[PDB]
Amino acid sequence: VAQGPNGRALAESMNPDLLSAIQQHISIERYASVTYLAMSIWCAERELAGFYQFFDGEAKDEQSHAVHFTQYLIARSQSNDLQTLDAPRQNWDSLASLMATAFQMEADTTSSIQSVYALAERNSDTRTTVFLDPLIDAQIQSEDQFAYLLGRVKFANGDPTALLVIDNELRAGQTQRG
Amino acid sequence: VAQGPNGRALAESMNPDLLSAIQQHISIERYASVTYLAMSIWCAERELAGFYQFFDGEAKDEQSHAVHFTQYLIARSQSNDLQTLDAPRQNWDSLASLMATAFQMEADTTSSIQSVYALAERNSDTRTTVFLDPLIDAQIQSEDQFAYLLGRVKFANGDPTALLVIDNELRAGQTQRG
Amino acid sequence: VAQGPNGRALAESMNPDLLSAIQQHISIERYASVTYLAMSIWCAERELAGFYQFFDGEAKDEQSHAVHFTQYLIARSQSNDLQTLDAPRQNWDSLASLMATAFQMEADTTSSIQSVYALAERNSDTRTTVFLDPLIDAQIQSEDQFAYLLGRVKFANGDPTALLVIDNELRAGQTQRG
Amino acid sequence: VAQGPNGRALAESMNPDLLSAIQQHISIERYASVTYLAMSIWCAERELAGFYQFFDGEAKDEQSHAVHFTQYLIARSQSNDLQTLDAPRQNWDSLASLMATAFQMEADTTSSIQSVYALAERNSDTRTTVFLDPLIDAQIQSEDQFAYLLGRVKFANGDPTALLVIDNELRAGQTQRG
Ligand SMILES: [Cl-]
Ligand SMILES: [Cl-]
Ligand SMILES: [Cl-]
Ligand SMILES: [Cl-]
Ligand SMILES: [Fe+3]
Ligand SMILES: [Fe+3]
Ligand SMILES: [Fe+3]
Ligand SMILES: [Fe+3]
Ligand SMILES: [Fe+3]
Ligand SMILES: [Fe+3]
Ligand SMILES: [Fe+3]
Ligand SMILES: [Fe+3]
Ligand SMILES: [Fe+3]
């Protein structure tokens, strides 16, 4: 039995470029987390309590995704390399602008997973494509959800009255089309 | 065993300037109470039933704070001196103006506690600083809450439709960021 | 009513040096979080599942502390400034060495809070000292706990059999003196 | 409607090389089963009752996997061909050596599935890749688990006291990192 780079027994070696791609993706999830924390704060500063609660939960969920990836590297007997984390964006001129950045962050998270997925396919790493499949499914749902929240905020057309109604929807847990 | 100014057994003497400061602060709490009663009436006169219910409860809570301070003076064997109470402000041109006065009243209540706190520190009265600590913590929460309600009302920008939505939030008990 | 730096109604201005100190402390809590994540991974790589579960939970708790501080700045109408986060330490020669770093991290977190506390006292910011008081109390308990875990691991004197017994204690939730 | 090789109605023909690969993989699962039975006996002979119970259950699970594959061939209207089964390895010099063989058996089971998966992809048999996807996911978890058990036994460094502690973990159902 061979030992993997993290010292555990190795079921199958992993291409170093694929390993680097996964370590980088963990940073993307962690950056999404702190970005949603920054968004939760921006909303709290403007008394948008439902949006604050929504993004507070999204920040925790993205961190959970990051940890889920670290556990996969452990399972593959590969080293983790937790990286320096950039500061998030913290300033927006409007809730519509913030929601556009949130949607982009979600789509960019999927693009990062897709990049890892393609590298795994090039290397015939079927464990990794199988690991990523449910995460892509979750990304479809999250993109659908963020397109819903962004679209509803844009429909409001900057009317504070409409944004208060939507804020109350989010506080109530009404966060997707259903 | 020595007897304190109110006749009870005295654990430790209190500086007369600190005692006067606490008696004055009791008046501040009582004045906050009648101010919130006046605000509850102003809101009721304009059919803002959620704001009326909110300020009706705040009036009762501030009175409870006043009584809590009278009990501390009893516990310290100090005399209470219940004072003449000024009439509250009763007229405002808008809900936003009323909410600004409410926020100021809350911040001024904290400033009064801070003034007592500093005098207790000058006199090394650790019983009094310990007594005030949880009241300052409650003031942080109340200032946060009143900044939330004021900010949400200002966001409404005088639109009656938005103010009705917020009024319904308050009637439902949705009175802070959460 | 004045507006604070984050745009909310301002109960009382905050010294900019104190604000910077709190923003820096938020980074300390976030760094403790990712440090405990790195420790959880190191333990998982060596099949120390109880230590892995313990540090996984500590990472989540430190993040919660960070968010708790961001909420205080919101409550004080002060700006948050989420900072670049350094990469954590990730390599240790032994569990005893890891636990020494964990204890130091906990003590250093308290030192950071103490530094903020002293600055608040210099500025007579009683809201901030009151806010920090329960966090210092929690730090006493955490230092006591980490001294317990470190001391028990050192008592084991590197015997794998003893470290397995302690690992099972932690998996069972037996993480302090009680 | 065409009839498949096993006589049932045929939804889509299967490449004979892919069919042979699946029939061979069924033998791999059955061989893993009898290997884990042999390991359970070796552990029982040495009073390692927790390891005996663990491998007794693994033997039953691998047989279930084999039957799951036979049901897929039925579903595809393909013939099953149950093969002669080799005798398992039955002798080991130590528990650490046994656990290394167990880990290798698990990794080799995954390699067999990967071989079938690649053949299905070459033949554009999407039913088969979809069928195998959750089995690969289960293999990741099993490899992670067996790396955990092997690593913990190796950490024990042959100390009977440590092996008794681990044996009791397994009897209690504590068989993975969690
Ligand atoms: Cl907007
Ligand atoms: Cl108004
Ligand atoms: Cl050690
Ligand atoms: Cl052994
Ligand atoms: Fe994510
Ligand atoms: Fe996401
Ligand atoms: Fe009060
Ligand atoms: Fe008050
Ligand atoms: Fe902390
Ligand atoms: Fe801590
Ligand atoms: Fe199997
Ligand atoms: Fe298996
Ligand atoms: Fe799938």
Coordinates of N, CA and C in Angstrom, one line a residue, chain C residues 40 43-50 52-53 158-161 163-165 167-168 171-172, chain D residues 144 147-152 155-157 159 161-163 165-166 169 174-178:
Chain C
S40 N -8.0 21.0 12.4 CA -8.9 19.9 12.2 C -8.4 19.0 11.1
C43 N -5.4 16.8 12.1 CA -5.9 15.7 12.9 C -6.6 14.6 12.1
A44 N -7.4 15.1 11.1 CA -8.1 14.1 10.3 C -7.1 13.3 9.4
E45 N -6.0 14.0 9.0 CA -5.0 13.3 8.2 C -4.3 12.2 9.0
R46 N -4.4 12.2 10.3 CA -3.7 11.2 11.2 C -4.7 10.3 11.9
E47 N -6.0 10.3 11.4 CA -7.0 9.5 11.9 C -7.4 9.8 13.4
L48 N -7.1 11.0 13.8 CA -7.4 11.5 15.2 C -8.8 12.2 15.1
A49 N -9.8 11.3 14.9 CA -11.2 11.8 14.6 C -11.8 12.6 15.6
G50 N -11.6 12.4 16.9 CA -12.1 13.2 18.0 C -11.5 14.6 18.0
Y52 N -10.2 16.0 15.3 CA -10.8 16.6 14.1 C -12.2 17.2 14.4
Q53 N -13.0 16.4 15.0 CA -14.4 16.9 15.3 C -14.3 18.1 16.2
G158 N 3.4 11.2 24.3 CA 3.6 10.7 23.0 C 3.2 9.2 22.8
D159 N 2.6 8.6 23.8 CA 2.2 7.2 23.6 C 0.9 7.1 22.8
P160 N 1.0 6.5 21.6 CA -0.2 6.4 20.7 C -1.4 5.9 21.4
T161 N -1.2 4.9 22.3 CA -2.3 4.3 23.1 C -3.1 5.4 23.9
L163 N -3.0 8.6 23.3 CA -3.6 9.6 22.4 C -4.9 9.0 21.8
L164 N -5.0 7.7 21.6 CA -6.2 7.2 21.1 C -7.3 7.3 22.2
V165 N -7.0 7.0 23.4 CA -8.0 7.2 24.5 C -8.5 8.6 24.6
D167 N -8.4 10.9 22.1 CA -9.2 11.1 20.9 C -10.6 10.6 21.1
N168 N -10.8 9.5 21.7 CA -12.1 9.0 21.9 C -12.9 9.8 22.9
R171 N -14.2 12.7 20.9 CA -15.3 12.3 20.0 C -16.6 12.2 20.8
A172 N -16.5 11.8 22.1 CA -17.6 11.6 23.0 C -18.1 12.9 23.5
Chain D
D144 N -12.1 6.0 2.2 CA -11.8 6.9 3.3 C -11.9 6.2 4.6
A147 N -8.9 3.7 4.9 CA -7.7 4.4 5.2 C -7.7 4.9 6.7
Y148 N -8.9 5.2 7.2 CA -9.0 5.5 8.6 C -8.7 4.3 9.5
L149 N -9.3 3.2 9.3 CA -9.0 2.0 10.1 C -7.6 1.5 10.0
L150 N -7.1 1.5 8.8 CA -5.7 1.1 8.6 C -4.7 2.1 9.3
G151 N -5.0 3.4 9.1 CA -4.1 4.4 9.7 C -4.1 4.3 11.3
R152 N -5.3 4.1 11.8 CA -5.4 4.0 13.3 C -4.7 2.7 13.8
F155 N -1.0 3.5 13.6 CA -0.7 4.4 14.7 C -0.4 3.6 16.0
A156 N -1.3 2.6 16.3 CA -1.1 1.7 17.4 C 0.3 1.1 17.5
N157 N 1.0 0.9 16.4 CA 2.4 0.5 16.3 C 2.5 -0.9 17.0
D159 N 1.0 -2.2 19.5 CA 0.8 -2.3 21.0 C -0.5 -3.0 21.2
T161 N -2.4 -3.1 23.7 CA -3.3 -2.3 24.5 C -4.1 -1.3 23.5
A162 N -3.3 -0.7 22.6 CA -4.0 0.2 21.6 C -4.9 -0.6 20.7
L163 N -4.5 -1.8 20.3 CA -5.4 -2.6 19.4 C -6.7 -3.0 20.2
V165 N -8.2 -1.1 22.4 CA -9.0 0.1 22.4 C -9.7 0.3 21.1
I166 N -9.0 0.1 20.0 CA -9.5 0.2 18.6 C -10.6 -0.9 18.4
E169 N -13.7 0.2 19.8 CA -14.3 1.2 19.0 C -15.2 0.6 18.0
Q174 N -18.0 2.6 16.0 CA -17.2 3.8 15.7 C -16.1 3.3 14.7
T175 N -16.5 3.4 13.4 CA -15.8 2.8 12.3 C -15.3 3.8 11.3
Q176 N -15.5 5.1 11.5 CA -15.0 6.1 10.5 C -14.8 7.4 11.3
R177 N -14.2 8.4 10.5 CA -13.9 9.6 11.1 C -15.1 10.4 11.6
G178 N -16.2 10.3 10.9 CA -17.4 11.1 11.3 C -17.2 12.5 11.0

